[PDB]
Amino acid sequence: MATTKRVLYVGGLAEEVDDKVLHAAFIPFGDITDIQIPLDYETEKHRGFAFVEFELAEDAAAAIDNMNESELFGRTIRVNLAK
Template identity: 65%
Template sequence: MAASTLVAVGGKGSNPKTALYVGGLEETVNDATLHAAFLPFGEIKEVNIPLDHATGTHRGFGFVEYEEKEDAAAAIDNMHNAELFGRVLKVNYAQPMKIKGGDKGWSHLPVWADTDRYIEEMDAENELSAYDKEQQKLKAKEAAGKEGAEEPAAPAAAAAASEAS
């Protein structure tokens, strides 16, 4: 008998141990096909195959959420590395959605929540820009000073060379 799959991290859905990621889907697989393939392992709460907005087709993966965590574990045990429409599936627990802004993401924060950090970054960027401009002006003055110092020395060297001949 195969050992049951252990869960170490949370996942997508209302109960993280019931939501599965299914990767390696063939392009003709749809929600109904995926539902039918995973139905033998238990009561399915939801099936979702995200679509690519540009092409209107799915991106080769989907999510299946079970009512019971034991059913999800059985589906992983039986369907991981199984074949569906000639493609080998990768099935494991779904990871939580990670959008910028930490575990909850920006979608859970008000629009103004990141304003302070943005203002600090802009101030630092402006200070850096001002510092760079100041450094460029100093380098330009130094370069002009060196050119001015070399010019008088050049006629003196030319005069010394003409006296020697």
């Protein structure tokens, strides 16, 4: 099976959370190669979720375990393999 295990889905993001906040919150688990945040151009705000891609799958795994249901900017977030 060749499907990646390096990309994580991160949901439950407060309005104040952006790519910088995400980088800072997930870098403790390992180097990150990409962070994508879908936007609504009518509002200019994100839709409450993002995808974080780690360099190593092992690091992505540790992040899922420690960050799923953790608190970020006052609320609970959801973290799991994106696909």
